[PDB]
Amino acid sequence: MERYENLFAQLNDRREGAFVPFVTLGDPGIEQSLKIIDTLIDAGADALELGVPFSDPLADGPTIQNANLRAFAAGVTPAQCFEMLALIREKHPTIPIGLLMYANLVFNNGIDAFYARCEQVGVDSVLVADVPVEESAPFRQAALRHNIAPIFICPPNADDDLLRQVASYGRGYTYLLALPLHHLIEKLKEYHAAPALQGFGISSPEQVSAAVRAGAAGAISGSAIVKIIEKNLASPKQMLAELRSFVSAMKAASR
């Protein structure tokens, strides 16, 4: 989790926000996915949020569901996902890497064993999509024991008690998914919660600036990136081009 601390420290000295893109590992193919990731990085991403394909993502929209299908057809497995992570980390040493997991993948071979494996390949944080704070204990405990930041989502329908818990158990950053936005950010800073990143439909440059201006440490592009991949499945060369272009713009807006 130290990588996240050092990232935000730096971003503050430059009065800049973080731009974090999300992608499903192995989509649309192992080697292509690796070039995409290298592109996102070279294009200016401050960090990465990487999904591991699951059979039943009960918490993802259709854009992600298809990306997950594409990765399975390519014969992608969790084991293969870990070899990729090692390669990405071997090439980019300081960039924070976060995983979006589903409970069963983490539980399968033992919770402690999963986080130990993450510590090995160089992962910095893990967000388990279907584990609310109420059931988080064994997950956040294993995460902390292996120096992994447990990330939690702060939903729109959040109450004060939820805010307190999130601020207390989370590390790395807070995943911001009614209540006035800036009010929500104020309260989190008050309880000393990890830096908040806006991850709700961030798909345009103005939205990133608006997120930063509201007190958020940055923004996460949940599916906007996955959309360019699907659009250009037939043209790998151009796919990278629109990715570079997009990301570059999104990041310029974080200044």
Partner: protein
């Protein structure tokens, strides 16, 4: 923080995205209040009796046990309005939805029986019903889809993932995350996140309560065993509930064996699966070596759930209930036997429980035993499936 315990031993829980928690908490609170409201109890009982047809008969088999020392009774859920035990609980959840001031119902279905059940309760109680269904199940169940539309339900086909159940069930939960303030999600079995396993059990417990009073009145004693099929576990837990503290009564759950446990093509996660986290709960399930959720298999579409209600996993673990499996062929034979000797066409799901009872009877014919099988439904729906098979065999 919850009012009731979301776990049965180590099984259960509420493994859902944070956004859904408020919905589960609101539901649990309304259920507790409702359980204590005599006016709710009175209303529910009125519908079950005057609309649904309860109490259902407890039929003594006349011919099927000849030449053995077994006395077999069948709890007739096949005679309930709708043709299956599902009706009891959809009515209950429908009332609870109204008590919460909700005006819309969301549900998903595979075999299509839960879809039909949710639609009839909604039509009756003036609730707006929308049902998510996987296209591959749609084409395969045109008859049930039509029933749903006759009853005013909107059938939303899902063009996603495996265009199957699991995608519909995920679209059903997604819909609920944004519309829970006005809509209730009517889960169709005793599984999923708390408080569903508890609620579904309680809205099905009359099955066992009636059977006990009926067997005591007819035989003056409790049965030696009560047997029921297990797909998700609602009809079984409905039968078992009232007998749990009666330790001399054996509780036997029957999972589909499909083509045979050894073939890998079956639906018995409780005895042959592995504990995992999915469907919002921690329970035994059918999954690969690396944790992907597999598909279960059975001739009966209604037992095709790749997991099982958490309370059943617990009862098994502590040894209060025993679970076995029965293959397609064994179920097919029990289906034929009941039609021929008793004049009752049972659902293929129910036939799995009957097959195991026939097995207990035929293996030890001089053993004196008093058995009760929960006939969870009628098999008119299965007529064509059974016909095609027997012809593919020249029968």
């Amino acid at each position: 923080t919850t009012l009731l315990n979301p776990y049965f031993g180590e099984f259960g829980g509420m493994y859902v995205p944070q956004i859904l928690m408020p919905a589960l908490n609101q539901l649990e609170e309304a259920f507790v209040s409702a359980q204590k409201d005599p006016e709710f109890q009175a209303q529910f009982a009125d519908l079950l009796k005057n609309y649904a047809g309860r109490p259902t008969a407890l039929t003594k088999c006349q011919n099927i046990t000849a030449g053995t020392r077994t006395t077999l009774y069948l709890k007739r859920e096949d005679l309930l309005h709708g043709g299956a035990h599902k009706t009891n609980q959809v009515l209950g959840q429908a009332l609870l939805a109204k008590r919460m001031g909700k005006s819309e119902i969301i549900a998903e279905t595979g075999a299509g029986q839960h879809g039909v059940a949710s639609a009839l309760a909604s039509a009756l109680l003036g609730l707006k019903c929308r049902i998510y269904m996987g296209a591959k199940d749609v084409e395969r169940q045109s008859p049930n889809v039509f029933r749903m539309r006759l009853m005013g339900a909107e059938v939303i086909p899902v063009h996603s993932g495996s265009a199957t159940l699991k995608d519909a069930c995920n679209e059903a939960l997604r819909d609920w995350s944004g519309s829970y303030e006005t809509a209730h999600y009517m889960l169709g079995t005793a599984a999923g996140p708390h408080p569903y396993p508890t609620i579904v059990r309680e809205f099905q417990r009359m099955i066992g309560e009636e059977t006990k009073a009926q067997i005591l009145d007819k035989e003056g004693r409790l049965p030696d065993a009560v047997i029921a099929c297990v797909g998700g576990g609602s009809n079984a837990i409905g039968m078992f509930a009232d007998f749990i503290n009666d330790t001399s009564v054996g509780l036997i759950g029957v999972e589909p064996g499909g083509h045979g446990i050894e073939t890998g093509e079956h639906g018995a996660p409780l005895k042959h699966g592995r504990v995992g986290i999915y469907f919002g709960m921690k329970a035994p399930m059918m999954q690969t070596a690396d944790g992907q959720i597999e598909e279960s298999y059975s001739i009966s579409a209604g037992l095709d759930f790749p997991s099982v209600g958490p309370q059943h996993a617990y009862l098994n673990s502590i040894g209060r209930a025993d679970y076995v499996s029965i293959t397609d062929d064994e179920a097919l034979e029990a289906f034929k036997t009941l039609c021929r000797h008793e004049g009752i066409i049972p659902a293929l799901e129910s036939s799995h429980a009957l097959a195991h009872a026939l097995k207990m009877m035929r293996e030890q014919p001089e053993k004196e035993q008093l058995l009760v099988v929960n006939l969870s439904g009628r098999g008119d729906k299965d007529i064509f499936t059974v016909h095609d098979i027997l012809k593919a065999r020249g029968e």
